[PDB]
Amino acid sequence: NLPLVVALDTEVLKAIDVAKRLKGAVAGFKVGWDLIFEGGISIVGEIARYGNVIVDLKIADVPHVASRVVEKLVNRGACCVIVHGFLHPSLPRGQHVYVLVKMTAPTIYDEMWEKLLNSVQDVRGFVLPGNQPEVVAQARKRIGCSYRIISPGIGPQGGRPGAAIEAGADFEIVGRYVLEDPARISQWAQYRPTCFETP
Amino acid sequence: NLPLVVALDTEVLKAIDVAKRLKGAVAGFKVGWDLIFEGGISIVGEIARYGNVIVDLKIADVPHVASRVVEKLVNRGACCVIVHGFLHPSLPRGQHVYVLVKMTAPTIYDEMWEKLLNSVQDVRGFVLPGNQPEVVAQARKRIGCSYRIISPGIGPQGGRPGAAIEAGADFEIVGRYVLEDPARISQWAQYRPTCFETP
Ligand SMILES: O=c1cc(O)n([C@@H]2O[C@H](COP(=O)(O)O)[C@@H](O)[C@H]2O)c(=O)[nH]1
Ligand SMILES: O=c1cc(O)n([C@@H]2O[C@H](COP(=O)(O)O)[C@@H](O)[C@H]2O)c(=O)[nH]1
Ligand code: NI
Ligand code: NI
CA of residue A198 relative to chain centroid, distance: 12
CB under 5 Å of ion ligand 4: residues: B 79-80, 199
Provide the CATH number for the domain around residue B59.
Answer: 3.20.20.70
The ligand whose atoms approach the alpha carbon of A78 most closely is: 3
Q: Give helix A133-143 / helix A109-119 axis angle, nearest 10°.
A: 20
Answer yes or no: are the C-beta atoms of B117 and B110 closer than 8 Å: no
* Contact at CB, B62 and A104, closer than 8 angstroms: yes
- The closest alpha carbon to A37, from B63, B49, B76, B19, belongs to B76
Other CB atoms within 10 A of residue B88 CB:
17
CA distance B179 to chain A (A): 15
Residue of B4, B6, B9, B113 with the most ligand 2 atoms within 8 Å of its CB, for mutation = B9
Does residue B155 line the site of ligand 2, with CB under 6 A? yes
The answer for B103, left when phi > 0, alpha when psi is -120 to 50, beta otherwise, is beta
Does residue A32 line the site of ligand 1, with CB under 6 A? yes
Which residues in chain A are closer than 8 Å to B112, comparing Cβ atoms?
A: 108
Answer yes or no: are the C-beta atoms of B124 and B94 closer than 8 Å: yes
Give the integer Cα–Cα distance in Å for B159 and B105: 12
From the CA of A32, give the closest atom in ligand 1.
17
Other CB atoms within 10 A of residue B49 CB:
12
* Contact at CB, B112 and A107, closer than 8 angstroms: no
Residues tagged in the binding site annotation of A for substrate: 9, 30
* Contact at CB, A38 and B41, closer than 8 angstroms: yes
Answer yes or no: are the C-beta atoms of B99 and B67 closer than 8 Å: no
Domain span at residue B74 reads 1-199
Q: Does residue B199 have a cis peptide bond before it, meaning omega lies within 30 degrees of 0? A: no
Ligand 2 centre to CA of A56 (Å) is 20
Other CB atoms within 10 A of residue A106 CB:
13
Ligand 4 centre to CA of A192 (Å) is 47
Answer yes or no: are the C-beta atoms of B44 and B19 closer than 8 Å: no
B77 phi/psi in degrees, rounded to 5: 125, 0
Does residue A173 line the site of ligand 1, with CB under 6 A? yes
Answer yes or no: are the C-beta atoms of A184 and A18 closer than 8 Å: no
DSSP assignment string, chain B: -EEEEEE--S-HHHHHHHHHHHTTTEEEEEE-HHHHHHHTTHHHHHHTTSS-EEEEEEE---HHHHHHHHHHHHHTT-SEEEEEGGGTTS---EEEEEEE-S-SS--GGGGTHHHHHHH--SEEEEE--TT-HHHHHHHHHHHTTSSEEEE--BSTTSBPTTHHHHHT-SEEEE-HHHHH-GGGGGGGTT---SS-S--
- Secondary structure, 3-state, chain A: CEEEEEECCCCHHHHHHHHHHHCCCEEEEEECHHHHHHHCCHHHHHHCCCCCEEEEEEECCCHHHHHHHHHHHHCCCCCEEEEEHHHCCCCCCEEEEEEECCCCCCCCHHHHHHHHHHHCCCEEEEECCCCCHHHHHHHHHHHCCCCEEEECCECCCCECCCHHHHHCCCEEEECHHHHHCHHHHHHHCCCCCCCCCCC
Ligand 4 centre to CA of B20 (Å) is 19
Give the integer Cα–Cα distance in Å for B120 and B93: 9
* Experimental method reported for this structure: X-ray
- The closest alpha carbon to B81, from A111, B68, A169, belongs to B68
CA distance B88 to chain A (A): 5
Largest CA distance in chain B: 44
Answer yes or no: are the C-beta atoms of A124 and A148 closer than 8 Å: yes
- The closest alpha carbon to B199, from B162, B170, B167, belongs to B170
- Number of structural domains chain B divides into: 1
Other CB atoms within 10 A of residue B94 CB:
11
* Contact at CB, B108 and A87, closer than 8 angstroms: yes
Answer yes or no: are the C-beta atoms of A50 and A29 closer than 8 Å: yes
Does residue B54 line the site of ligand 2, with CB under 6 A? no
Contacts with B182 (C-beta within 8 Å, 6 or more apart), sequence order? B18, B21, B22
- First CA to last CA across chain A, in angstroms? 11
Query: In angstroms, what CA-CA distances link B91 with A20, A117, B63, B86?
Result: 35, 24, 8, 8
Give the integer Cα–Cα distance in Å for B83 and B90: 11
Give the integer Cα–Cα distance in Å for B172 and B164: 7
CA of residue B152 relative to chain centroid, distance: 7
Answer yes or no: are the C-beta atoms of A49 and A81 closer than 8 Å: no
* Residue of A20, A23, A58, A115 marked active site: A58
Decide: residue A91, CB within 10 A, 0-12 exposed, 13-18 middle, 19+ buried: buried
Query: In angstroms, what CA-CA distances link B165 with A24, A70, B108?
Result: 55, 32, 25
